[PDB]
């Protein structure tokens, strides 16, 4: 699911004019448009840091998995963090990261570093492996995991007997299905796609804006310096007026499209905070919300600008 | 334990008045977002928009009327763009409140009109009830929730083997105060003795790892005694 | 006289501290700033570390309840 998008800031004066004081003087006569455009992009940008804090900052305390990691025979090495890798990203998380890998258009940095967005995921995935659903409803209370699974079987209508009695088979089936997960993404089908569409959507968005800086918009030339010098002062301002208006519209279209796109991401960051509570911190009785079948559990993993739940 | 629950609810309801009075930013954000938008529209009326002056009257008075039209068009086009941006941002803002009205209709239906089993939809905790209070352009819901507290550590065993048949607990967990084995309800400690009433017997004592031997009491046999 | 470089940019007027506390004014890139008395920039603390005590045979059962009337606007 895609949780957040790139937070960008645009300087109206450099973009509309750019090393042309005479243009800046003309721009003021247009109005407060620069102020509203910065207010719009600043709100999109602060939301992009609440979209990423509502999804992963659920847990109050950074819980930690034990030094010895034997959990009933279920093997979580592929999911739980290992110290050798970049950050301490876990092996599936490393693959997802490697898979996905100006002219005033600044790109602000996200407030929470991927070292932290990843440490939040280690707490979420280390008290869901010890305590259970308890961590999200109060003080985290420890339950041995081959027993948390029997309580999660009872919620699909199947008795506890069907886990302890068939425990090793259930464990091998979990460990093997966990193993194929890396290959399913790493067989190179376009699985990440949804997150990568967001990067591509944003990069194309900026490219249209930068490549519209080269458009006459019905004026004599795309270069302000030539028009300023090659035209007389009254003539220059009237032709310049088309250039500033067109560039103001191109910046305005970027923000309108960007607010519509931010809404789609806020919708996907509110579906991933209903799936990091109902599915990561409880068992969901809703149907097909959390898997085709009867949900037994779900595990969070952080990918570039989004979340993968297994 | 009815009185404790009653005072805990009653005091907690008391703190809400002060805490709300330390909060309503989400509701005041809408009032502010709307005001800024209306004034930006009024101030744009006071902007030249690449014209000799904002006032239409002065433009008509100090220019010849047939020639003045192109300058007038400059103002009208700018103001139509200004209104069109108002309507477009307002359409995008309307669909943020429609999304919030839809979650409030859902929270009213699944929390005021019933008890939700969804996690953290109606408070952080296990929902017990929820109360609706009107606020100026929104709703404030006083979600009531049961929060487990004061934990204690015990030794847990998955099955209890008596007479070579595994016995699993019908509802609950098997817990030990160090020496005596008991069956407890999971979300509140209520230690109880193990009898066939609270235990389901399935299988033999050689298939589950962690079965602990003990005595599952028989209720019928002592009355026979 | 206090200058310090962070991924977001150069923060002038604030002295980097090696202490860690919660985020009051979020500067960006993992660094948060507040007012000690001077203005101190630090690395945000995600929260307090707790290690749940996982064990093959230990459970913890909640022995009391609290009734909390939270508010959502």
SS3 of chain A: CCCCCCCEECCHHHHHCCCCHHHHHHHHCCCCHHHHHHHHHHHHHHHCCCHHHHHHCCCCCCEECCCCCCECCECCCCCCCCCCCCCCCCHHHHHHHHHHCCCCCEECCCCCCHHHHHHHHHHHCCCCCCCCCHHHHCCCCCCCHHHHHHHHHHCCCCCCHHHHCCHHHHHHHHHHHHHHHHHHHHCCCCCCCHHHHHHHHHHHHHHHHHHCCCCCCCCCCCCHHHHHHHCCHHHHHHHHHHHHHHHHHHHHHHHHHHHHHHHHHHHHCCCCCCCCCCCCCCCCCCCCCCCCCCCCCCCEEEECCEEEEC
Q: Who's near A224: CB < 8 A, 6+ residues apart?
A: A17, A18, A20, A23, A240, A243
Which residues lie below 8 Å from residue A18, measured CB to CB, with a gap of 6+?
Answer: A103, A104, A224
According to DSSP, residue B197 is labeled G
C69 vs B: CB within 8 A: yes
DSSP secondary structure letter of residue B113: S
**Å from B224 to nearest chain A CA?**
31
Cβ distance of C73 and B155 shorter than 8 Å? no
* Resolution of the coordinates, Å: 3.2
What is the C-alpha separation between A170 and A71, in angstroms, rounded? 13
Rounded Cα gap, residues A46 and A44, in angstroms = 6
Nearest C-alpha of chain A: how many angstroms from B147?
Answer: 6
Task: Give chain B's largest Cα–Cα span.
Answer: 119
Q: How far apart are CA C64 and CA B8, in angstroms?
A: 12
A57's torsion region: left (phi>0), alpha (psi -120 to 50) or beta?
alpha
Write the Ramachandran bin of B144: left for phi over 0, alpha for psi from -120 to 50, otherwise beta.
beta
| Chain B contact present for C49, CB below 8 A | no
Q: Give me C50's structure tokens.
A: 């707790």
- Cβ neighbours of residue B68 closer than 8 Å, sequence gap 6 or more: B59, B60
- CA neighbor of A59 nearest in space, from B127, C64, B128, C52: C52
Pairing of strands A306-309, B138-141: unpaired
A76 vs B47: CA distance, rounded Å: 63
DSSP codes of every residue in C24-73: SEEEETTEEEEE---EEEEEEP----EE----TTEEE---EEEEEE--B-
Chain centroid, CA B34 distance in Å = 26
**Which residues are paired to C3 by β-bridges?**
C12
**Strand-pair category, B126-129 with B144-149:** antiparallel
A71 reaches C (C-beta below 8 A) = yes
On whether the CB atoms of residues A281 and A136 are closer than 8 A, the answer is: yes
Helix segments in B21-126, DSSP class H: 25-45, 56-62, 65-107
Residues B182 and B177: their CA atoms lie apart, in Å, by 8
**Under 8 Å CB-to-CB from A216, ≥6 apart: which residues?**
A222, A243
How many whole angstroms separate alpha carbon A298 and alpha carbon A153? 14
Breaks (C-N over 2.5 A) in chain A follow: 101
Residues of chain B neighbouring A245 (CB-CB closer than 8 A): 50
Taking an 8 Å cut-off on Cβ atoms, the answer to whether B187 and C57 are in contact is no
Query: How far is residue A83's CA from residue B77's CA, in Å, rounded to a whole number?
Result: 61
Distances (CA, A) of A89 to A75, A98, A119: 17, 11, 9
Rounded to the nearest 10 degrees, the angle between the axes of helix B65-107 and helix A233-268 is 10
Cα C6 to the center of its chain, rounded Å: 18
Residues of B in contact with C62 (CB under 8 A): 148-151, 187-189
* B151 in A contact zone (CB under 8 Å): yes
**After which residue numbers is chain C interrupted with C–N beyond 2.5 angstroms?**
36
User: Among A124, A129, A139, C66, which Cα is nearest to B152's?
Assistant: A139
In whole angstroms, give the CA distance from residue A232 to residue B190: 92
Partner residue opposite A62 with nearest CB, options C30, C49, C61: C49
* Nearest C-alpha neighbor of A293 from the set A281, A282, A302, A284: A284
CA distance linking residue B109 with residue B123, whole number of Å: 15
Selecting from B13, B141, B188 the residue whose C-beta is nearest the C-beta of C62 gives: B188
Cβ contacts (< 8 Å) between C54 and chain A: which residues? 65-66, 71, 129-130, 142, 144-145
Q: How was this structure determined?
A: cryo-EM
Helix (H) or strand (E) holding B12: helix B2-20
Count other Cβ atoms within 10 Å, centred on residue A130: 25
Q: Are B205 and B211 in contact (CB under 8 A)?
A: yes
CB A100 within 8 Å of CB A192: yes
Is A137 exposed, middle or buried (CB count within 10 Å of its CB: 0-12, 13-18, 19+)? buried
β-partners of residue B145 are B127, C68
> Quick one: closest CA in C to A139, which residue?
C62
Residue B52, SS3 per DSSP: coil
Query: Which residue has 């998955």 as its token pair?
Result: B158
Instruction: Count how many Cα atoms sit within 13 Å of the Cα of residue C11 in the half-sphere of its side chain.
Output: 21
Contact (CB, 8 A) for A309 and A298: yes
Instruction: Kindly give the pairing relationship between strand B132-135 and strand C31-35.
Output: unpaired
B210: DSSP letter: T
Chains contacting B (3 or more CB pairs within 8 Å): A, C
Which of B149, B203, B210 lies at the smallest CB-CB distance from A161? B203
Backbone angles phi, psi at B163, to 5 degrees: 60, 25
């Amino acid at each position: 699911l895609p949780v957040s998008m790139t937070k960008t800031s645009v300087d109206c004066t450099m973009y509309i004019c750019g090393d042309s004081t005479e243009c800046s003087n003309l721009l003021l006569q247009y109005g407060s448009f620069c102020t509203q455009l910065k207010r719009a992009l600043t709100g999109i940008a602060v939301e992009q840091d609440k979209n990423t804090q509502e999804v992963f900052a659920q847990v109050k305390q950074i819980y930690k998995t034990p030094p010895i990691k034997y959990f009933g025979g279920f093997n979580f090495s592929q999911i739980l963090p290992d110290p050798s890798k970049p950050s301490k990203r876990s092996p599936i998380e490393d693959l997802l990261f490697n898979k996905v890998t100006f002219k005033g258009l600044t790109v602000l940095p996200p407030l929470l570093t991927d070292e932290m967005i990843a440490q939040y995921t280690s707490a979420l995935l280390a008290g869901t492996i010890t305590s259970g659903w308890t961590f999200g409803a109060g003080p985290a209370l420890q339950i041995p995991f081959p027993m948390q699974m029997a309580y999660r079987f009872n919620g699909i209508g199947v008795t506890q007997n069907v886990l302890y009695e068939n425990q090793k088979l259930i464990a091998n089936q979990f460990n093997s299905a966990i193993g194929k997960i890396q290959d399913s993404l790493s067989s190179t089908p376009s699985a990440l796609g949804k997150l990568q569409d967001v990067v591509n959507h944003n990069a194309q968005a900026l490219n249209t804006l930068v490549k519209q800086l080269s458009s006459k918009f019905g004026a004599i030339s795309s270069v302000l310096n030539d028009i300023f010098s090659r035209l007389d002062p009254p003539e220059a301002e009237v032709q310049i007026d088309r250039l500033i208006t067109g560039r103001l519209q191109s910046l305005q279209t970027y923000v309108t499209q960007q607010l519509i796109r931010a809404a789609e991401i806020r919708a996907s960051a509110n579906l991933a905070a209903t799936k990091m509570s109902e599915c990561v911190l409880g068992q969901s009785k809703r149907v097909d919300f959390c898997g085709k079948g009867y949900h037994l559990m779900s595990f969070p993993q952080s990918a570039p600008h989004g979340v993968v739940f297994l | 334990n009815q009185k404790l629950i009653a005072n805990q609810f009653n005091s907690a309801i008391g703190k809400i008045q002060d805490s709300l009075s330390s909060a309503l930013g989400k509701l005041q954000d809408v009032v502010n977002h709307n005001a800024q938008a209306l004034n930006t529209l009024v101030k744009q009326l006071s902007s030249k928009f690449g014209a000799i002056s904002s006032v239409l009257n002065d433009i008509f008075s100090r220019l010849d009327p047939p020639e003045a039209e192109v300058q007038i068009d400059r103002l009208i086009t700018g103001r139509l763009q200004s209104l069109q941006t108002y309507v477009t941002q307002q359409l995008i803002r309307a669909a943020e409140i429609r999304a919030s009205a839809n979650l409030a209709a859902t929270k009213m239906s699944e929390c005021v009109l019933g008890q939700s089993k969804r996690v953290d939809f109606c408070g952080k905790g296990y929902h017990l009830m929820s109360f609706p209070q009107s606020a100026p352009h929104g709703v404030v819901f006083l979600h009531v929730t049961y929060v487990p507290a004061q934990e204690k550590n015990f030794t847990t065993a998955p099955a209890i083997c008596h007479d070579g048949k595994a016995h699993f607990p019908r509802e609950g967990v098997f817990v030990s105060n160090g020496t005596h084995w008991f069956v407890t309800q999971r979300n509140f400690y209520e230690p109880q003795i193990i009898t066939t009433d609270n235990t389901f017997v399935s299988g033999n004592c050689d298939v589950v790892i962690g079965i602990v031997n003990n005595t599952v009491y028989d209720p019928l046999q002592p009355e026979l005694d | 006289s206090n200058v310090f470089q962070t991924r977001a940019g150069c923060l002038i007027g604030a002295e980097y501290v090696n202490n860690s506390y919660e985020c009051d004014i979020p500067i960006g890139a993992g660094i948060c700033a507040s007012y000690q008395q001077s203005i101190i920039a630090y690395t945000m603390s995600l929260g307090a570390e707790n290690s749940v005590a996982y064990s093959n045979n230990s459970i913890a059962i909640p022995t009391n309840f609290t009734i909390s009337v939270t508010t959502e606007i």
